[model samples]
Target: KGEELFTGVVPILVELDGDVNGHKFSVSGEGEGDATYGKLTLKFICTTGKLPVPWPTLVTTLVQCFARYPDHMKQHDFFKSAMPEGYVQERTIFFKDDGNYKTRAEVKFEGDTLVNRIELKGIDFKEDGNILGHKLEYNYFSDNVYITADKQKNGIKANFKIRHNIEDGGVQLADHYQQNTPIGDGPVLLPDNHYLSTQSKLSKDPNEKRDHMVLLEFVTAAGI
Candidate 1:
């Protein structure tokens, strides 16, 4: 018992929301889980706006930061278990600085497989101005979320109202994800234009190709 001790790594993903001065920013990252002393080392991969330095009263500011977190963030089981904690892992993230919104998400399981999906919304090409000055802006967005309790894979057929809707110019801005697909543990990146279609106008240009990605890492913790 004295010579040998427990040692291994636990996978974790954390989304931290904070305010700088009065501005709100969020960061999501994969981090290390310290079972020995209950410490967490965050390696932020996605962030909103960024941060700055500080001085005295740092402790006060830090405590306030902890206090400001929404009750759900504060009451996370991840704090205790140091694993990815959430009933649903739904969030809207950006592709490059394009502001073309895409989402990576998970909302429980529908039996054997997890209900995972990726989405894109709010399309516009003004920011990526290209030859001919083409622009296509639309309100349409696409995400295939499972609604049924039955254990089956959902695809384009699963999303009826959204696919059949005519209000959003009768076109799909983004692509729907394959339901019941397994996104194995650790980290993964959505293929470029996998969520947001590249078949559209300006995005067709190979020069300004866009990609949506985030990093996730794992490390072991030990105490002596």
Candidate 2:
């Protein structure tokens, strides 16, 4: 008998990575089904290797961003209004330079649906007591609503934005970013915008790389 795969039954793996303060790290997760009105859960575990002391702080930020699972699905317009508190309308670099930091991020999806988005923030310190901050924000999408298969090279694509403000009363900057890649076996893409490129690699097999491999990429857009 021939086999049929259910739309939401099959699972997909997505990987994400980026650089922070000259250090590198990667995270792998998974997603399933359509993203507009379907349920999706992205689990992440940090990769190995020595990172800056502030690296953990960036990781914490990533976790907090994902912790707020969608309580109710809504259209893009409504979703913007429903974003959680402290959901800064600004950019990632604004957060970084305001604190002397940097970050990297990635996301993956199954078919045209997004599953998860990963971010890495970094902070730079100076002997003179100066600090700078940076951040990477990734928006993943499934269903190819705003984005398309041709635009994504027949695979998942990411559209991102980055902004920054200096802690010592510096100017703020923002920009649009994009990336498209085919589904394969290893590493995600590098960081862009104000974020420094870190580790964006993947494992040969997700099952064998459980804690550190990703299988999904969540899709969403930046605010302001």
Candidate whose TM-score is highest: 2
lDDT of 1: 0.24
Candidate maximizing lDDT: 2
lDDT of 2 at 107: 28
* Cα-lDDT of candidate 2: 0.32
* Model 2 C-alpha lDDT per residue in residues 54-140, reported as the tens digit of each score: 222332223112211133321122112212211111113323233333333332333533333545444454323222223222222
Which 10-residue window in model 2 sums to the lowest lDDT?
82-91
> What is residue 153's positional error in candidate 1, in angstroms?
42
The lDDT of each candidate is 0.24, 0.32
Q: How do the residues 147-187 of candidate 1 rate in per-residue lDDT, one tens digit apiece?
A: 22112321111111122122334332322222222223322
Off by over 4 Å in 1: 1-7, 36-41, 52-224
Q: So what's the TM-score on candidate 2?
A: 0.33
